[PDB]
Amino acid sequence: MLVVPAIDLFRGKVARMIKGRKENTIFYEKDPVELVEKLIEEGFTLIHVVDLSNAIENSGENLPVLEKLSEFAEHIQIGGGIRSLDYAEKLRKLGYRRQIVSSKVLEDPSFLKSLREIDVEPVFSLVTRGGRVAFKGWLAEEEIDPVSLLKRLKEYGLEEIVHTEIEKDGTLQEHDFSLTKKIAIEAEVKVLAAGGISSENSLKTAQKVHTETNGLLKGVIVGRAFLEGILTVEVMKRYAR
Numbered sequence: 001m002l003v004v005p006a007i008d009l010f011r012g013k014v015a016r017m018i019k020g021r022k023e024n025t026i027f028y029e030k031d032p033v034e035l036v037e038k039l040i041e042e043g044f045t046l047i048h049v050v051d052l053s054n055a056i057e058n059s060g061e062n063l064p065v066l067e068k069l070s071e072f073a074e075h076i077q078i079g080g081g082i083r084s085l086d087y088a089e090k091l092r093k094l095g096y097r098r099q100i101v102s103s104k105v106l107e108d109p110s111f112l113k114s115l116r117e118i119d120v121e122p123v124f125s126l127v128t129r130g131g132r133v134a135f136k137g138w139l140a141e142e143e144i145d146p147v148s149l150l151k152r153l154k155e156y157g158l159e160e161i162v163h164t165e166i167e168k169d170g171t172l173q174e175h176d177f178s179l180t181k182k183i184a185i186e187a188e189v190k191v192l193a194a195g196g197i198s199s200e201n202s203l204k205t206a207q208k209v210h211t212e213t214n215g216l217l218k219g220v221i222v223g224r225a226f227l228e229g230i231l232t233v234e235v236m237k238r239y240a241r
Contacts, residue, residue, distance in 0.1 A: 001210040002046055002219030003203065003240040004192060005039050005226050007032050009062040009080075010052035016224060018170040022056060028227055033068050040072055042233050047076045048162075048194075048221045050100070054081020070094035077123060079162075085114050092118050100125045100162060106135075109156040116157060123192075124153060124161045131179050134166065146179075150187040160190045162221065168196030169224050177205045184209075184216035194221040199230065203239035 008015045010025065014032050018024035032049075039047055049069065053059040058081065069076060079100025082088055088099060102125040104111045115122040126146060127134040133149055135141035150161065163180050167173075175196040184191040193206060197220045210217045219240070225231040 001207050001215075001217070001240060002192070003044075003236045004046045004048050004077075004219055004221045005044060005236070006048040006050070006194070006221045006223030007035060007227075008050045008052050008223065009065055010056075011061055012065060014227070015052055016170065016227070017052065017056075019167050024170075030227070032065055036069055036072055036076070039233075040075055043237065045075060046098075046219075047072075048100075048192075048223070049076050049078050051078070051080030055079070066091070066094065066096075070096070073097065079123075079125060085111070085118075088115060088120055089118055092120050097121060098123055098160075102127075105153065105156075109153065112153070112156045112158055121160060122158070124150070124158055126150070126161050126163045126183075127166045128163065128179070129165070129167050131176070146183050147186045150183070150189050154187065154189065158189065160192075160218075162192045162194055164221075165195030168198075169194065171196070171224075172198060174198055174202055174205075175220070177202075177209050180217065181209045181213060184213045188216065190216060190218050192218050192221055194223070197222050198225055200235060203231075203236070207239055 014028040014030045016026050051062045053061045073095030077098035078091060078096045082099050082101050083104040098121045100123045105124055112122050132141055133144050133146055163183055165175055173196040175193055180193045206220045222231055
């Protein structure tokens, strides 16, 4: 199973937004480029970097950092603001081969293919609250089961997702691995789990579902608990076999 450390970037710096909330913004004093080097040397193969300035702002402030993070791209999976092919190409040029996409794929599901013509592995970001897909639309977010969405995206060549329980991370709450398992298993998509990856009980559960699903659960993304020291590098690596 993969244990994937998460760094969020906002206004140049390492940031967390509590449950995605913009002025619930907190900044860490860490060098995102050194932290990434450190994570590399400690032996981590995958790292989740989200550009919070592109996703929320449509800003380019973090590009300088990604230009320098691009030393370690074959190791980094990048998200935030990837809504046009032109931008995806820039990233791919730097070496960024796994890219988290979302809103664009629901605007135009052919975006997945365009991304395969440029050796990008499109990773679809699936946010859910209370087990309900966080569609902007009313009936859509009430009625469309996660499985139903990804089953249709599968037809457009989708393979890998990140399933984020947005309202959990930034807190004690544990990730609902029952959901994630159902998702991985019924949609037959590879899943990285995010949100409420809070403690050791979570990696334990994750490992067990990583098994229950023949690896359809790739692993978890640790953001909150990683940066703050709840889960240390020692404890994380113990759970990546």
